[PDB]
Amino acid sequence: PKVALYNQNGSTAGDIELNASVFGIEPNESVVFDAILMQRASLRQGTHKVKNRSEVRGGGRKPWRQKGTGRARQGSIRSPQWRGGGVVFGPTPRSYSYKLPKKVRRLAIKSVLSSKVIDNNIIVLEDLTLDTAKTKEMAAILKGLSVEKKALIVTADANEAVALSARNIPGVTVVEANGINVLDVVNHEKLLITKAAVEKVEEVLA
Amino acid sequence: MKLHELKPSEGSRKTRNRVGRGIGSGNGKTAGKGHKGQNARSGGGVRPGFEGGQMPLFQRLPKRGFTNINRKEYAVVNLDKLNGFAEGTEVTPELLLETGVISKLNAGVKILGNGKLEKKLTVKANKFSASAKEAVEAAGGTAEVI
Amino acid sequence: PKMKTHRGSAKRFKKTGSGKLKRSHAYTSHLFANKSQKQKRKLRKSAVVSAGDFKRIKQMLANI
Amino acid sequence: PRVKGGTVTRKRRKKVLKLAKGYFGSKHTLYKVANQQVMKSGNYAFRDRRQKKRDFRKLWITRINAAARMNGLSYSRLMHGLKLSGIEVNRKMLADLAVNDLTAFNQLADAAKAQLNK
RNA sequence: GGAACGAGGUAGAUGAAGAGGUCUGGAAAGGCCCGCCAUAGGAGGUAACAGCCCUGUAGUCAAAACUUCGUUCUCUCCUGA
RNA sequence: GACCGAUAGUGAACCAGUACCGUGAGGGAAAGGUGAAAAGCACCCCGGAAGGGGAGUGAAAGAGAUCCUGAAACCGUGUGCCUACAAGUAGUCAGAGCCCGUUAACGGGUGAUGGCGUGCCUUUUGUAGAAUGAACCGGCGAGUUACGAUCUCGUGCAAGGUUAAGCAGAAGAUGCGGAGCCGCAGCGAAAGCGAGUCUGAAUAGGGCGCAAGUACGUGGUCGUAGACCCGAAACCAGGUGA
RNA sequence: UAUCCUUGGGAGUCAGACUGCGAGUGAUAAGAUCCGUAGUCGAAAGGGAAACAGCCCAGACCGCCAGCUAAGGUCCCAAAGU
RNA sequence: AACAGUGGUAGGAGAGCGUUCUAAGGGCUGUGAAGCCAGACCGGAAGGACUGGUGGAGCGCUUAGAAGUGAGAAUGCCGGUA
Ligand SMILES: [K+]
Ligand SMILES: [K+]
Ligand SMILES: [K+]
Ligand SMILES: [K+]
Ligand SMILES: [K+]
Ligand SMILES: [K+]
Ligand SMILES: [K+]
Ligand SMILES: [K+]
Ligand SMILES: [K+]
Ligand SMILES: [K+]
Ligand SMILES: [K+]
Ligand SMILES: [K+]
Ligand SMILES: [K+]
Ligand SMILES: [Mg+2]
Ligand SMILES: [Mg+2]
Ligand SMILES: [Mg+2]
Ligand SMILES: [Mg+2]
Ligand SMILES: [Mg+2]
Ligand SMILES: [Mg+2]
Ligand SMILES: [Mg+2]
Ligand SMILES: [Mg+2]
Ligand SMILES: [Mg+2]
Ligand SMILES: [Mg+2]
Ligand SMILES: [Mg+2]
Ligand SMILES: [Mg+2]
Ligand SMILES: [Mg+2]
Ligand SMILES: [Mg+2]
Ligand SMILES: [Mg+2]
Ligand SMILES: [Mg+2]
Ligand SMILES: [Mg+2]
Ligand SMILES: [Mg+2]
Ligand SMILES: [Mg+2]
Ligand SMILES: [Mg+2]
Ligand SMILES: [Mg+2]
Ligand SMILES: [Mg+2]
Ligand SMILES: [Mg+2]
Ligand SMILES: [Mg+2]
Ligand SMILES: [Mg+2]
Ligand SMILES: [Mg+2]
Ligand SMILES: [Mg+2]
Ligand SMILES: [Mg+2]
Ligand SMILES: [Mg+2]
Ligand SMILES: [Mg+2]
Ligand SMILES: [Mg+2]
Ligand SMILES: [Mg+2]
Ligand SMILES: [Mg+2]
Ligand SMILES: [Mg+2]
Ligand SMILES: [Mg+2]
Ligand SMILES: [Mg+2]
Ligand SMILES: [Mg+2]
Ligand SMILES: [Mg+2]
Ligand SMILES: [Mg+2]
Ligand SMILES: [Mg+2]
Ligand SMILES: [Mg+2]
Ligand SMILES: [Mg+2]
Ligand SMILES: [Mg+2]
Ligand SMILES: [Mg+2]
Ligand SMILES: [Mg+2]
Ligand SMILES: [Mg+2]
Structure with missing residues (x-):
């Protein structure tokens, strides 16, 4: 669909036409949900462990004879009902990652991109060239574009000055065109793409 | 979509059943295993295709x-x-x-x-x-x- | 790990087009003096695994 | 993540103990016996809400019988006579009159006697 | 076996911006109203929760000595159809 | 770090492989928290001291040394109602009297007396059971995870569906990667033939076929793993002891 | 009258008890044992049979200080006929 | 709306409550967080508030996610105390 093409300063320099196959689809809310869960699951480190009765120190001998003492029968001081005993089940190191079908991955990214167009949270820029890598300048540009809350800045190639300038601002992430992902798109309110980046995204997705 | 208003597809996700968590659930106490015998035991039950010592089906029939x-x-x-x-x-x-x-x-x-x-x-x-x-x-x- | 096929069963049974198990008959080894020709003609042919048995053994041939 | 037992256990058990206030000795103090007694109290309360309706009807009949016999009728004949007269005043109300307004009760008893003496 | 050159390791150095006002308070890092820095909004500390108080952080520097890696020369060795 | 937070997490947050136990090999604990700062209570008083009451410090001392919080069992002091003719699974429903006054409700406490009423659990044909288990209170204490299988549901694509290792990339998403896997064709032991095929001498008859899957997710169940938790007597290996 | 069948997922059960009726075993004993048949218990509280799983009556979603009945009852305990 | 139904062990099925952690959003809190104590409040249940006291720094709520997710019994284990 058609959107306003801005500059760094915040003046409108005509209207770019986005690819309707990428930016104009009906968002599939079920695949977006699946894509978010999957991505959040993939971030999990899963480094958790407990000692079962075998792994707890000691506990080899039978605490006391089977019969005659008047006590409950016990096999080990580290049996799970004992204080200081092994855990039954409990966490073990594991991955939480899984892969959705590639077509579902594509539909998820197109859905959230096309959702940003519907919500009018897509700011297509002519270019984003910070001369000096300065955070004050990046902050001024974002005020210039009325970007109050969070924002994902999307450059075509790895822009050093933009990446450095935005690094320290809370809630402002910078990615290349290839580094766009569902979770980053959905988590940031505004999506600031350059014209070069939009072309690079449309190359892959369409 | 919003991260604060996520919703699964209807019928895509169910709550898991947790046995042995009290009588109200209907799987309290015996955890749906009934009373005693080999099938109620931890690691219990016979191997697949075992017929309690009746000659198993596969073994009654010829190789072909x-x-x-x-x-x-x-x-x-x-x-x-x-x-x-x-x-x-x-x-x-x-x-x-x-x-x-x-x-x-x-x-x-x-x-x-x-x-x-x-x-x-x-x-x-x-x-x-x-x-x-x-x-x-x-x-x-x-x-x-x- | 991967579930192991029951190898004894894989040598006796075979999956049909609609997912039934084809089987041979028992009583087809020896002692043919003690069986009628009618018995022998019928035992020669193939048969299906029954519903009750199929329930018991279906997973043993899952990989086939 | 680990879930400690925490506060849920104390909160649940304490509510049972507050329901056991006034019970004798350990039955208001200790959770296990308080719990049993609160449960037993439930069975009894359910049963007795039913028995209450039996016990009050029994009480009203006894009082109607006493008042009837002051008017020279048994309860059996009074109720027969009231049924024949088509008086549909219930036993609670008849027993209320028997205590509170015996002259009104006597009129109803006279109405019953009129039908019986037919 | 030697030298030279480069990049690391084993100590460190430098390092932007608010005691802003006011309100509660034992204390302000908190509230309210205002600034400012940011290649630094990692973190820990500080009388309650601190990018701007301290130790720091980003960035940029630094080694007498021992040590690791690489490179070049030296050095050493050597006909293959 | 969708790991633990002092019964957890290492056996060990603390002078722990210590103390303690054992001839020895060996077994193997308990035990964290004053305060922002010691400003760690000068001085007076009772007491031999301990301990306390003032005073002072502090935001707080009912933060004063196993000194943050401080549950329950358990032990006490005070007293509103009841209680010395009563037969009690201890309540429940009915109910005066007396004493109160609330999250203000056809309220709260107590309970003379009346009716009814043999705890809970387990295990059983059947248990108030003279079967089992629990002194009480607190904490801890049991269907899990991985990889396969299968079914239901969901989603994507659909006669197709899907990549694995790996490479690049935050330990990420994702891109690339088509090797491989399942399905679209079956029948037959097989050669093989194929909407058929096998049996059979047979255009016969009969068998099995003909006339939506797949990738991923949640859930149910199954397999292999200790596989819901606790429990033997024993077996074997290497040591330690006259 | 509203069940029934098929396919697939998930089970539990394989100690039963008494009562009536029909039989065996026994001694035409057993609260015995073993079948058949129906019921109840099991897994069913309520009313009756003093008390009393299995008998008689009857199936408790919850509330009521309404009413009619069942078995069983109506002199007093104890509701209703001296 | 009408009509009918709603005892239940093993067991199948469904709908929910609460706990810790995470994400996102939105809040609370030294003008007093969690915890603890008390109450005559609210919901069909699991449970949830409100008020006051103690406490002295953290914690809800919404939606989704993940589980060391719920104890009264194991002659259970440890502690305390009868
Ligand atoms: K089951
Ligand atoms: K320990
Ligand atoms: K008292
Ligand atoms: K009583
Ligand atoms: K005994
Ligand atoms: K044919
Ligand atoms: K599908
Ligand atoms: K599954
Ligand atoms: K299992
Ligand atoms: K019979
Ligand atoms: K409080
Ligand atoms: K568990
Ligand atoms: K216990
Ligand atoms: Mg061991
Ligand atoms: Mg442990
Ligand atoms: Mg059940
Ligand atoms: Mg239980
Ligand atoms: Mg059992
Ligand atoms: Mg049994
Ligand atoms: Mg069984
Ligand atoms: Mg042969
Ligand atoms: Mg924790
Ligand atoms: Mg617990
Ligand atoms: Mg009635
Ligand atoms: Mg400095
Ligand atoms: Mg100031
Ligand atoms: Mg504080
Ligand atoms: Mg503690
Ligand atoms: Mg420990
Ligand atoms: Mg010694
Ligand atoms: Mg205090
Ligand atoms: Mg403190
Ligand atoms: Mg304390
Ligand atoms: Mg007296
Ligand atoms: Mg007397
Ligand atoms: Mg017995
Ligand atoms: Mg006794
Ligand atoms: Mg026993
Ligand atoms: Mg005992
Ligand atoms: Mg206990
Ligand atoms: Mg031997
Ligand atoms: Mg020796
Ligand atoms: Mg010697
Ligand atoms: Mg029988
Ligand atoms: Mg018998
Ligand atoms: Mg018959
Ligand atoms: Mg039973
Ligand atoms: Mg029945
Ligand atoms: Mg009865
Ligand atoms: Mg009776
Ligand atoms: Mg019973
Ligand atoms: Mg009548
Ligand atoms: Mg009478
Ligand atoms: Mg029912
Ligand atoms: Mg009913
Ligand atoms: Mg179930
Ligand atoms: Mg907490
Ligand atoms: Mg409060
Ligand atoms: Mg648990």
């Missing part, structure tokens, strides 16, 4: 046959699949594999005679059924053994 070491299985292609191609196309095994009419080649391509063919094709294949070779030739084509 052998596996041929040199068995050829062909990637079969019915006539209805060949209708996808336009007239004048030399339908080779490489073309069928590249277009994805067949997924794997195996011993080779056999053309079989289910469905209709209404395309003049130079079908090149390892094998043909009698009816397939007829149907290719009948509609102007050339069945070629390769």
Whole structure:
């Protein structure tokens, strides 16, 4: 669909036409949900462990004879009902990652991109060239574009000055065109793409 | 979508059943295992196909046959699949594999005679059924053994 | 790990087009003096695994 | 993540103990016996809400019988006579009159006697 | 076996911006109203929760000595159809 | 770090492989928290001291040394109602009297007396059971995870569906990667033939076929793993002891 | 009258008890034992049979200080006929 | 709306309550967080508030996610105390 093409300063320099196959689809809310869960699951480190009765120190001998003492029968001081005993089940190191079908991955990214167009949270820029890598300048540009809350800045190639300038601002992430992902798109309110980046995204997705 | 208003597809996710969490659940105490016996025990139950010492089914019945070491299985292609191609196309095994009419080649391509063919094709294949070779030739084509 | 096929069963049974198990008959080894020709003709042919048995053994041939 | 037992256990058990206030000795103090007694109290309360309706009807009949016999009728004949007269005043109300307004009760008893003496 | 050159390791150095006002308070890092820095909004500390108080952080520097890696020369060795 | 937070997490947050136990090999604990700062209570008083009451410090001392919080069992002091003719699974429903006054409700406490009423759990044909288990209170304490299988549901794509290792990339998403896997064709022991095929001498008859899957997710169940938790007597290996 | 069948997922059960009726075993004993048949218990509280799983009556979603009945009852305990 | 139904062990099925952690959003809190104590409040249940006291720094709520997710019994284990 058609959107306003801005500059760094915040003046409108005509209207770019986005690819309707990428930016104009009906968002599939079920695949977006699946894509978010999957991505959040993939971030999990899963480094958790407990000692079962075998792994707890000691506990080899039978605490006391089977019969005659008047006590409950016990096999080990580290049996799970004992204080200081092994855990039954409990966490073990594991991955939480899984892969959705590639077509579902594509539909998820197109859905959230096309959702940003519907919500009018897509700011297509002519270019984003910070001369000096300065955070004050990046902050001024974002005020210039009325970007109050969070924002994902999307450059075509790895822009050093933009990446450095935005690094320290809370809630402002910078990615290349290839580094766009569902979770980053959905988590940031505004999506600031350059014209070069939009072309690079449309190359892959369409 | 919003991260603060996520919702799964209806019927995509159920709550897991947790046994042995009190009587109200209906799987309290015995955890749905009933009372006593081998099936209620931890690690319990007999191995698959065990009939409590009655001679098992598999063991009552005879072994049959052998596996041929040199068995050829062909990637079969019915006539209805060949209708996808336009007239004048030399339908080779490489073309069928590249277009994805067949997924794997195996011993080779056999053309079989289910469905209709209404395309003049130079079908090149390892094998043909009698009816397939007829149907290719009948509609102007050339069945070629390769 | 991967579930192991019951190899004894894989040598006796075979899956049909609609997912039934084809089987041979028992009583087809010896002692043919003690069986009628009618019995022998019928035991020669193949049969299906019954519903009750199929429930018991289906997973043992899952990989086939 | 680990879930400690935490506060849920104390909260649940304490509510049972507050329901057991006034019970004797350990039955208001200790969770296990308080729990049993609160449960038993439930069975009894359910049963007795039913028995209450039996016990009050029994009480009203006794009082109607006493008042009837002051008017020279048994309860059996009074109720027969009231049924024949088509008086549909229930036993609660008849027993209320028997205590509170015996002259009104006597009129109803006279109405019953009129039907019986037919 | 030696030298030279480069990049690391084993100590460190430098390092932007608010005691802003006011309100509660034992104390302000908190509230309210205002600034400012940011290649630094990692973190820990500080009388309650601190980018701007301290130790720091980003960035940029630094080694007498021992040590690791690389490179070049030296050095050493050597006909293959 | 969708790991633990002092019965957890290492056996060990603390002078722990210590103390303690054992001839020895060997077994193997318990035990964290004053305060922002010691400003760690000068001085007076009772007491031999301990301990306390003032005073002072502090935001707080009912933060004063196993000194943050401080549950329950358990032990006490005070007293509103009841209680010395009563037969009690201890309540419940009915109910005066007396004493109160609330999250203000056809309220709260107590309970003379009346009716009814043999705890809970387990295990059983059947248990108030003179079967089992629990002194009480607190904490801890049991269907899990991985990889396969299968079914239901969901989603994507659909006669197709899907990549694995790996490479690049935050330990990420994702891109690339089609090797491989399942399905679209079956029948037959097999050669093989193929909408059929096998049996058979047979155009016969009969068997099995003909006339939506797949990738991923949640859930149910199954397999292999200790596989819901606790429990033997024993077996074997290497040591330690006259 | 509203069940029934088929396919697939998940079970539990394989100690039963008494009562009536029909039989065996026994001694035409057993609260015995073993079948058949129906019920109840099991897994069913309520009313009756003093008390009393299995008998008689009857199936408790919850509330009521309404009413009619069942078995069983109506002198007093104890509701209703001296 | 009408009509009918709603005892239940093993067991199947469904709908929910609460706990810790995470994400996102939105809040509370030294003008007093969690915890603890008390109450005559609210919901069909699991449970949830409100008020006051103690406490002295953290914690809800919404939606989704993940589980060391719920104890009264194991002659259970440890502690305390009868
Ligand atoms: K079950
Ligand atoms: K320990
Ligand atoms: K008292
Ligand atoms: K009583
Ligand atoms: K005994
Ligand atoms: K046929
Ligand atoms: K599908
Ligand atoms: K599954
Ligand atoms: K299992
Ligand atoms: K019988
Ligand atoms: K409080
Ligand atoms: K558990
Ligand atoms: K116990
Ligand atoms: Mg061991
Ligand atoms: Mg442990
Ligand atoms: Mg059940
Ligand atoms: Mg239980
Ligand atoms: Mg049991
Ligand atoms: Mg049994
Ligand atoms: Mg069983
Ligand atoms: Mg033979
Ligand atoms: Mg924790
Ligand atoms: Mg607990
Ligand atoms: Mg009644
Ligand atoms: Mg400095
Ligand atoms: Mg100031
Ligand atoms: Mg504080
Ligand atoms: Mg603690
Ligand atoms: Mg420890
Ligand atoms: Mg010694
Ligand atoms: Mg205090
Ligand atoms: Mg403190
Ligand atoms: Mg304390
Ligand atoms: Mg007296
Ligand atoms: Mg007397
Ligand atoms: Mg017995
Ligand atoms: Mg006794
Ligand atoms: Mg026993
Ligand atoms: Mg005992
Ligand atoms: Mg206990
Ligand atoms: Mg031996
Ligand atoms: Mg020796
Ligand atoms: Mg010696
Ligand atoms: Mg029987
Ligand atoms: Mg008997
Ligand atoms: Mg019969
Ligand atoms: Mg039973
Ligand atoms: Mg029944
Ligand atoms: Mg009865
Ligand atoms: Mg009775
Ligand atoms: Mg019973
Ligand atoms: Mg009547
Ligand atoms: Mg009477
Ligand atoms: Mg029911
Ligand atoms: Mg009913
Ligand atoms: Mg279930
Ligand atoms: Mg907490
Ligand atoms: Mg409060
Ligand atoms: Mg648990």
